[PDB]
Amino acid sequence: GSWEIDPKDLTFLKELGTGQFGVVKYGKWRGQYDVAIKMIKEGSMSEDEFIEEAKVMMNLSHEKLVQLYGVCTKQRPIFIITEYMANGCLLNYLREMRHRFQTQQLLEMCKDVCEAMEYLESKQFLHRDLAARNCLVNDQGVVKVSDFGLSRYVLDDEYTSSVGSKFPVRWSPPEVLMYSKFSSKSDIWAFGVLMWEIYSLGKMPYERFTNSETAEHIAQGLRLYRPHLASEKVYTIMYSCWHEKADERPTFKILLSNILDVMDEES
Numbered sequence: 001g002s003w004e005i006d007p008k009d010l011t012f013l014k015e016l017g018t019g020q021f022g023v024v025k026y027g028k029w030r031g032q033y034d035v036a037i038k039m040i041k042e043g044s045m046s047e048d049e050f051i052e053e054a055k056v057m058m059n060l061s062h063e064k065l066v067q068l069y070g071v072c073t074k075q076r077p078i079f080i081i082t083e084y085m086a087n088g089c090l091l092n093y094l095r096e097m098r099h100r101f102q103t104q105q106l107l108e109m110c111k112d113v114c115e116a117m118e119y120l121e122s123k124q125f126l127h128r129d130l131a132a133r134n135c136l137v138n139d140q141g142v143v144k145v146s147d148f149g150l151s152r153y154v155l156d157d158e159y160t161s162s163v164g165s166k167f168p169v170r171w172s173p174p175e176v177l178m179y180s181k182f183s184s185k186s187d188i189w190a191f192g193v194l195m196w197e198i199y200s201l202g203k204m205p206y207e208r209f210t211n212s213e214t215a216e217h218i219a220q221g222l223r224l225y226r227p228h229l230a231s232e233k234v235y236t237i238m239y240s241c242w243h244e245k246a247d248e249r250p251t252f253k254i255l256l257s258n259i260l261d262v263m264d265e266e267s
């Protein structure tokens with residue numbers, strides 16, 4: 001099958017990290033091309049369902065989405081083969097103060113993500129866990145969105161339950177926390193939090209609160225406030241993502257227009 005990579009074509013070279021599905025390694029495909037290789041730990045994934053969806057994800061192709069190259073499914077553990085991103089996860093990248101980012105670079109990271117999410121929205125495809133930890137950075141400083149949709153195949157109830165200890169409370173709108181109502185507009189809410197992460201250089205949202213306290217405050221209408229590095233116009237964009245009413249939040253196409261307008265006005 002066109003989605004199937006022969007694992008004998010992989011050369012494993014370095015460890016990259018560990019996530020919800022286990023260890024991820026850096027390697028080469030056919031001795032030449034850089035790849036990341038997720039080694040799916042036994043019992044962590046609804047594997048048959050993922051394999052069917054892998055066909056759909058294969059045809060999601062955008063310059064700002066981390067590309068799915070294929071899967072290795074004829075052995076266990078199965079492998080997911082993706083685009084390699086030399087500079088790793090966006091969250092850690094933001095927290096490296098040596099970069100001494102200009103605010104123009106921060107806005108370009110937001111635009112990179114927003115372009116990927118506009119593409120996903122045009123395909124009616126939800127990320128479901130958009131956040132700085134699920135964005136990666138390549139050798140040119142381009143940010144790309146990673147592991148989109150994969151939350152549907154996580155078997156860990158601590159991650160999937162809204163009261164679960166691993167659930168992304170701090171990236172979730174009130175209707176998700178209250179009713180598990182997921183939609184394009186919960187992706188929009190999370191994108192606003194991601195913009196805040198970027199302009200806060202990777203601070204934890206609601207950093208002095210627990211998850212339980214965050215959920216209560218968000219329901220009462222509390223919001224994140226303006227990062228020091230965000231202009232008023234940039235703050236207006238991220239804040240528009242957090243309307244209590246989901247139908248009042250923008251689309252990613254509107255967010256992209258707004259971000260491009262601010263790039264013109266500030267640079």
Ligand SMILES: CC(C)(C)c1ccc(C(=O)NCc2ccc(-c3ncnc4[nH]ccc34)cc2)cc1
Nearest residue numbers: 016017018019020024036084085088129150151
């Ligand atoms: C819950 C959810 C959203 C479904 C989910 C979230 C994360 C993971 C995951 O696998 N996280 C670990 C991880 C991911 C990517 C890379 C990586 N990929 C490419 N190039 C790279 N360069 C440096 C690192 C690196 C490394 C490690 C799985 C699932």
